[PDB]
Amino acid sequence: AHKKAGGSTRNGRDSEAKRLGVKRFGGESVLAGSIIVRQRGTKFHAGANVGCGRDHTLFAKADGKVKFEVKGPKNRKFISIEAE
Amino acid sequence: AKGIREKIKLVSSAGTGHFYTTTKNKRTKPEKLELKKFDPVVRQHVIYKEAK
RNA sequence: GGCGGCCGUAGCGCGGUGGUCCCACCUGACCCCAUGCCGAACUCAGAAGUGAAACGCCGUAGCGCCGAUGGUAGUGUGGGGUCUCCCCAUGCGAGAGUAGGAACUGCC
RNA sequence: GACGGAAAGACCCCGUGAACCUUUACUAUAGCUUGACACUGAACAUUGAGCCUUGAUGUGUAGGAUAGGUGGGAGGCUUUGAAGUGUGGACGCCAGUCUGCAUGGAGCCGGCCUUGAAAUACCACCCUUUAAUGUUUGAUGUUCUAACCCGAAUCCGGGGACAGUGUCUGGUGGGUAGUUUGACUGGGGCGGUCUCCUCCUAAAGAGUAACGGAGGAGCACGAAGGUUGGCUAAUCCUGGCAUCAGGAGGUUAGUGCAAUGGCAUAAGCCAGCUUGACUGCGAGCGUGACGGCGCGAGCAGGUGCGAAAGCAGGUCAUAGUGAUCCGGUGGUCUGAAUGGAAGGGCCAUCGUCAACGGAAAAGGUACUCCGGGGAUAACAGGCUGAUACCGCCCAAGAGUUCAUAUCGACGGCGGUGUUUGGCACCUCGAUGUCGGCUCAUCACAUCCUGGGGCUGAAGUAGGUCCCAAGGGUAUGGCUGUUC
RNA sequence: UGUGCAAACACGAAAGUGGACGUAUACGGUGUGACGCCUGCCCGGUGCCGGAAGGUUAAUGGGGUUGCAAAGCUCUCGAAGCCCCGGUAAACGGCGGCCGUAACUAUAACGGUCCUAAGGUAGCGAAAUUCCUUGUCGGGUAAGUUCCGACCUGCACGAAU
RNA sequence: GCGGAAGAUGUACGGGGCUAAACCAUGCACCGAAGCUGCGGCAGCGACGUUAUGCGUUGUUGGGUAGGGGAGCGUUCUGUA
RNA sequence: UCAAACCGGGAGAUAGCUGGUUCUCCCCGAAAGCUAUUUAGGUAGCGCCUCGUGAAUCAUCUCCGGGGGUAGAGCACUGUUUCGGCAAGGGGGUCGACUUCCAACCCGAUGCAAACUGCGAAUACCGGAGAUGUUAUCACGGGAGACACACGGCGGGUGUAACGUCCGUCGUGAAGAGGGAAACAACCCAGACCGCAGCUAAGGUCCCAAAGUCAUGGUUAAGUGGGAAACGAUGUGGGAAG
RNA sequence: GCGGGCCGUGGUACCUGUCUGAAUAUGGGGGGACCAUCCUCCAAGGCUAAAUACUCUGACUGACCGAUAGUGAACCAGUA
RNA sequence: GCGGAUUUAGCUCAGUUGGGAGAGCGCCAGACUGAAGAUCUGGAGGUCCUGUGUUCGAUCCACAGAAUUCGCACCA
RNA sequence: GCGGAUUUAGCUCAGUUGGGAGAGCGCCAGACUGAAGAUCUGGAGGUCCUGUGUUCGAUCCACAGAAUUCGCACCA
RNA sequence: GCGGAUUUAGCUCAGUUGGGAGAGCGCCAGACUGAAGAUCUGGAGGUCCUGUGUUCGAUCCACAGAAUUCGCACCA
C-alpha cells in the first residue's frame, strides 16, 4: 500500500532517448528530438533553454513542437530557411 | 479465465454488418445494457449491442 | 486620470503624497439574466460616504533576477622530485566582498 | 640430492560416464478377474426395454369459483353400441354410468340439469401417464445338453460350458529397470538466487557486474476516462479533536500502483454533463543490420464533447507478459463430373505455461572404470591477522595511610605469527593423511644452578623479568589415538 | 502363509516340463534360529485380504437436440476391481512438553495439564541398539573415556525391523 | 643522524677501492646500440609517367608469436623441340 | 574373464573429451561484447585479421551548435549530533515570580550525511560548418577469428572469509629490439636490412673495462653508502620571538 | 465393419486376421474424396519368348605397385 | 474448457402432491432430581443459492448466473 | 555466526476484511447441599515479546532489538 | 584455558517503563479449638555476588573481578 524507506528515485534501466532533427536541413513538421513524451507549443525552431542558449534553423513547415521540458521547451516565434 | 469475474468477453452485433468488436463488462450494474452507436466496416452509423 | 514609447534590473514586499478629472469600494437590486443549497457568483441600476484595497507620482534594495570593477581557496592541463607526497608551468578562479537598477520617457 | 628410477591412488571433485539393487517415476509387455463378439443348445424362475390387445382412467383438505387443473361457479333448453340411481358388484390395490345378469320405485332419458361444510353442454398441445395382457428383445441366477479337458485298450468313466483358449479395453499393479530431475554460489552442501519495472553502485552522455545495500509488478477499474462550472489543499493557531466561522499557509496535500519528474484561479477537489478506447493508409523514432509490440507526428473519410481551436489510438510517464502445433469463434477460396455433408488456408481476438523466451513426470550409489580439466574442496607453503600470544603509552582503582613497591580496569598505540578463521595466482597430468617410532644432518625469544634488573626488595623467604646450554631431560598403567 | 492335485509354486515363444516313480504325520513360499528368563503401553498414518447403501467406471445399440441424411452436443444404462466400514502392528510405525505433592539439594516415584490416541507397568536399558555422556552413584586400581552392578525422563534403544 | 631493533656451517657496495674513484645539487667531453649521420647492395603502401604489378622519379623506408597472403626449389611419369 | 563369458559378426559405433599433425624465404599482423541457434573452448547477422566489389565525403587529434551532474565543493534529504540566546509545553522545590531538568522550533558561531544542495568543473557525448585532408568518412556485399583476459601495485564496491567475482587507474604477458638499473616483464632513455665510417642516446667514464681519477658549489664523516616504525634526545648547526 | 502390418499413400496404396455380405452384362468396376447422372474397361481361373548379373575358369591389357611396395602368400605360406 | 452431483432454520439433512417449510442435534426455558446427568415436554431460529420467466399461487416447472465436489482436458 | 518456527489474561491456545481481545482450566464469589463434591451462573485476571515507524485508528503492516526452539556452523 | 547459564530476606524463587524489593515455605505472635492440628490474619527477616563507571536517581545499563554449574580443551 503506502510507501516507506526514504530515498531518491528507485533504479531503472538504460535511458532510451536520442536527438533527431538536425533542423538545419529538411525538416517535416514532427517531434524534433527524443527524450520525454508529451509536449506542445513550438511550431518552428525555438531552441531556448536556461544556459548559454540554444538554436536551430532553416525549414519551412507549419508547426513543430519539441519533446518536453528539456532541450529548449520554450516556444519562440517562427523561423524558416531564408527564402522558401 | 472464464468463471466468476467482473470482465467478460462478448462480441457486438451491428445487425447486417460483419460484427467484430471487443468490449468487456464487469458485474456492477447496469447489466442488460451493452454500449451504444458503433461504426463497423460497412455502412455508416449502424446498430450496436455488444451483448450476446 | 487620459494617451504613447522602451518594452522581463518593470518577480516581491514596503513608504510618502495628489487630482472631488478619474477610479475602484460602496449603495440599491425594480428588470434583461443567473446561482444544484446561496444575484455572494452572475447581471443590472443609483451614486449618500471614503480613499481603508486601484491609477498618477515617488521613497527604501530586503529578497528574486540581470549586468560591472576587483581576487584567495578550488580546478583544467603537461612536465619534476618524493616512502606516502608534493611541486612547477599555464587557462581560470570557491565565494566573499565593493557597487549598479525599485522604473525609464513624451504629451494633454 | 639429482622435487632419483618406476607400477599413470582405491581417499576427493570433475567428466549431462558405466553398473547394480531399489521408491509413493514414465511408457509398455505377460498373467489374473470380468463383460461382450466367434467356440456357450434346450427347460424353469427373476428383472429391464420395445411393440399389440383389453379395462379404468393415479393423485390429495372447506359457497365468490367450480375442477387434470383452474378461473369460472352452483336443481338451465338438442350425442357411439339395454346396465346409469336411491342402498347392487370385482383379479393386481380404491369410486361416478355402460353392455349379452336378475329382476321391483322410483318416474318414459334423462340423472341433469340455479343448495356454503355433499355443485353445468361440442373435433392436435405439459397426462399425451399410470395399471394389465400378447409378441420381439437386453442383463442376472438355476437345471439340463453336443463342444472342450483328463483317466481307460476299448466300452466307458470323471469333470463340465467353470472352462481351455484367442483378441482387445479400463483399473490396480516393486514383482522388474534408468539419476533423466538445469544454474549461480565467498569448494561443495545447508541457507539464499534464474521473467519484468523503477535511486544508489555506473567513476556528470552512453553502456556497465556480483546470494550488491533499499522496494515492488503480474493485477485492479466504465471510472480513479473526457469536458465544463465552482473551488483549492496539507498542517498549525484561535472559538467547541467529529462540524462550522476567521487567520497563517507555492503546496509538506492530492493526483490508482513500486519512484523520480510535472501541476493550485491546476492534470488537485466538488458538482453536472457526457463518453475519441472510430475506420483506412502512410512518413518517423530503438549507436549497428534484427520481428512482434509501443510511441510521437500527418493525410483521407467519418463517431463524442466543446462556441471553436482543440483533445483520443484507456487510466500523468516508465512493471501487470509469452511462439509453433491443435481446439473454440467472425467473410471467402478449395478437391474425375453434379447435388447433399464431412474436411484443408490469409488477418485478428480470447484460453495455458508466475522453476514466467517457456520438457507432460520424483529419487541412492565406499566395487568402480575411462577420456580430460585446476574452470571443483578436505592438507603443507605464502598473504592478512579480526581471533591468538606478548609488549608499550596513560592510568582509575585495590593496596590500613600511601597509583607507580606485586595486581592492574577503561581507552589508545605496536610486535610476533606457535593458534584459529581462514580473500584459491602455486601442486589435485596427484610434494597418499595425523601422531608416534626408528635414523642422519643444520639452530635458539628457556625451569634449576651461574651472572644481573625491578621489588608490595627492612632482614629472611618469595614474585616478575633479562641473560645463559656448560652439562643433564634416563622411565610407566587405560586408549590406535596426537595435544 | 497357499494348496485335495487337470492344486499351490516355479520353468518355456510354443510343443511341453520340474516338484509326482509325491500327495497335506505332503509340499511349496518366508520369519525366527539354539539353550535359559522371556515378555508391559498405542493402530491416528501402507501392503494384502473380505464385505459393501451411495459416489467413480468405455464403445456398440437406444433416447433428445442439431442437420430434408451426416458431423457435432447431450442423456440413459454399466461386470471384475476399486471408493465405503471393519479386522490386522511375528503392516511400514508413533511414545514430545508442563505444574503440583514431596526432598538440606538434584533425580527417580505418583496424579493431573497440554499436544498427536496412549506416554511405557514385565524384564532389562546410555546395551554393539541414546547425541548430550570420559551421564550420575559405585566396585576395582596408585589412577582406568575399558569392564561389571544400579538408577535411568527411552537426542534418533525396546519388542521374532 | 639517533634510542625503540637478539638467532642460525665464513661477514662487506659487482670487486679493487674511493674523502670522494661516496653521496647530494649541476654541468662538460667521450667509450658505449644492429640507435643517429655518411659510402656500396632491399621490401610493403601511396603519387607521377606507363599496356605494365616491366623501368625512371618521388613521400613513407624495413622487429614479431597465433594467424592471413605470396614466391621457391628437391621429385616421378607419360608430350614437342 | 562377470555389478555379467569368450570368439567372430552388423564399427574405421557415436563424443560439445585428450593427444597428434614434419621443407625455405618475403609482406602485414589480434581478441576477449550484443541478438538468435539442441547454442554457449561451434556457426550466421555483428564488435576484431585478410581479400574482391560497391558508394561517397567526412572524420577526428581540432573547432563550433546541444544533452548528462559525478569527483570536488558547498552544505543538503534523512536519520544523529556541539554550544549560547529567545518564545511556548510538562514535572519537582518554596511565593500566581524564579531556579533546575527534558522534548520540538528559529537565529548566529559549530557544523553533519550510503540515498542532498544557494552554487558548481574536468570531462565524455548528439547535430552542423573549417586548418587538415580531397578521394580519407561513409553506404553495400563475401569469407573468417569471436562474445572462457588475467596478474602485480594503488583506490576501491559487495564480501562476517580461500592462490576471487566485479569496476577504476597504471603497467606490463600481448606485438618490441638495443640498454642501464648487479641479476629482472613492466623504473629511466630510446626503437632493428647488409658491410662500413662518424657522432650521440642507455648507462658508464680511477683500475679489471672501452671512455675525464673532468668543471663550479655545497653537505656528510656517517663508509653513512641504504629496510625500518609509534616513541625519546643541551650530538650539532641555522633562524625568529619574551 | 473391427483390430494390425507395411507403403510416398494422404478419409485417395497393398496385404493379413475376425465378422458381415451383392448384383450379374435390360450387370458391374474404374477415372487418387462420398452418393445419383458420362468416358473407359470388365476382376473374383491359368500360361507365356525376347532386352541387364557375377566372375570360379581361359586369354588380353593397364601413365597401377615392386618384394618392411603390392593379395596375408613373386622364396615351405595360408606354411612356420 | 467439457459433463455429472450438490447449493433448506448454527450443524447434519428429509421434503416433486404447486398451494403445510420440517426433523435430529445444538441453544434457551420448563418439569424432574437436594442438585447436577441423562431421558421427556415447550419455545426461538429459513432472503428453502441468486435473478428472471412460466402459473391463480412454486422450495418443489423453464431459462440464465454463481458456489461446492468429482471425472475429463490443459498444464514447452 | 547463519536460516526457519515460536514469543496473547496463572497454564494450554484460537484469533488477517486494521478498527470486538476470546476459549478450556485455574482463582474468588454467588447458588445449591446439613455441609462438603461435582455441575451451573457471575466477576476478577491480558505493557495480546519490546521500541520505533506507517494509517483516520494496528494484537492483526514495515523496520530494529530480545527470548524460546530446531537445523547448520565452530570446538589441540 | 575457552564458551554458555546461574550468583535476591534461613530455604526455594518471581521481579526490565531506572526510580515500589516481593511471594511460598519456615520462624514468632494473634484468632480458633478443652487444647493440640490444619486453615486464616499479623510481624520480623535483604551489604537484591563485589568494585567501579554510566544517570537527576539502577537489583533492573556498561566494565572488571569472584563463586556455582554445564559444554568444550587438553594426561609417559
CSV table of N, CA, C and O (backbone and C1' of nucleotides) in Angstrom, one decimal, chain E residues 42-46 89 91-94:
chain,number,residue,atom,x,y,z
E,42,C,P,-2.7,-49.9,25.1
E,42,C,O5',-2.4,-49.0,23.8
E,42,C,C5',-2.8,-47.6,23.8
E,42,C,C4',-2.4,-46.9,22.5
E,42,C,C3',-3.0,-47.6,21.3
E,42,C,O3',-4.3,-47.0,21.0
E,42,C,C1',-0.7,-47.3,21.0
E,43,C,P,-5.4,-47.9,20.1
E,43,C,O5',-4.7,-47.9,18.6
E,43,C,C5',-4.3,-46.7,18.0
E,43,C,C4',-4.0,-47.0,16.5
E,43,C,C3',-5.2,-47.5,15.7
E,43,C,O3',-5.8,-46.3,15.1
E,43,C,C1',-3.4,-48.9,15.3
E,44,G,P,-7.1,-45.6,15.8
E,44,G,O5',-7.2,-44.2,15.0
E,44,G,C5',-6.6,-44.1,13.7
E,44,G,C4',-6.0,-42.7,13.6
E,44,G,C3',-5.1,-42.5,12.4
E,44,G,O3',-5.8,-42.2,11.2
E,44,G,C1',-4.1,-41.6,14.3
E,45,G,P,-5.8,-43.2,10.0
E,45,G,O5',-4.8,-42.5,9.0
E,45,G,C5',-4.0,-43.3,8.0
E,45,G,C4',-2.7,-42.7,7.8
E,45,G,C3',-1.6,-43.7,7.2
E,45,G,O3',-1.7,-43.7,5.8
E,45,G,C1',-0.7,-42.6,9.1
E,46,U,P,-2.2,-45.1,5.1
E,46,U,O5',-1.2,-45.3,3.8
E,46,U,C5',-1.4,-46.3,2.9
E,46,U,C4',-0.1,-47.1,2.7
E,46,U,C3',-0.3,-48.4,1.9
E,46,U,O3',-0.2,-48.2,0.5
E,46,U,C1',1.0,-48.8,3.9
E,89,A,P,-2.6,-57.5,15.6
E,89,A,O5',-1.5,-56.6,14.9
E,89,A,C5',-0.7,-57.0,13.8
E,89,A,C4',0.5,-56.2,13.7
E,89,A,C3',1.4,-56.2,14.9
E,89,A,O3',2.3,-57.3,14.9
E,89,A,C1',1.2,-54.0,14.0
E,91,A,P,3.6,-58.0,12.1
E,91,A,O5',3.5,-57.5,10.6
E,91,A,C5',2.4,-56.8,10.1
E,91,A,C4',2.8,-55.8,9.1
E,91,A,C3',3.7,-54.6,9.6
E,91,A,O3',5.1,-55.0,9.7
E,91,A,C1',1.9,-53.8,8.3
E,92,C,P,6.1,-54.0,10.4
E,92,C,O5',6.3,-52.7,9.5
E,92,C,C5',7.1,-52.8,8.3
E,92,C,C4',7.2,-51.5,7.6
E,92,C,C3',7.6,-50.3,8.5
E,92,C,O3',9.1,-50.3,8.6
E,92,C,C1',5.7,-49.7,7.4
E,93,G,P,9.7,-49.5,9.9
E,93,G,O5',8.4,-48.8,10.5
E,93,G,C5',8.6,-47.9,11.7
E,93,G,C4',7.4,-47.0,11.8
E,93,G,C3',7.3,-46.2,13.0
E,93,G,O3',8.0,-45.0,12.8
E,93,G,C1',5.2,-47.2,12.7
E,94,G,P,8.9,-44.3,14.0
E,94,G,O5',7.8,-43.6,14.9
E,94,G,C5',7.2,-42.4,14.4
E,94,G,C4',6.1,-41.9,15.3
E,94,G,C3',6.4,-41.9,16.8
E,94,G,O3',7.0,-40.6,17.2
E,94,G,C1',4.4,-43.1,16.6
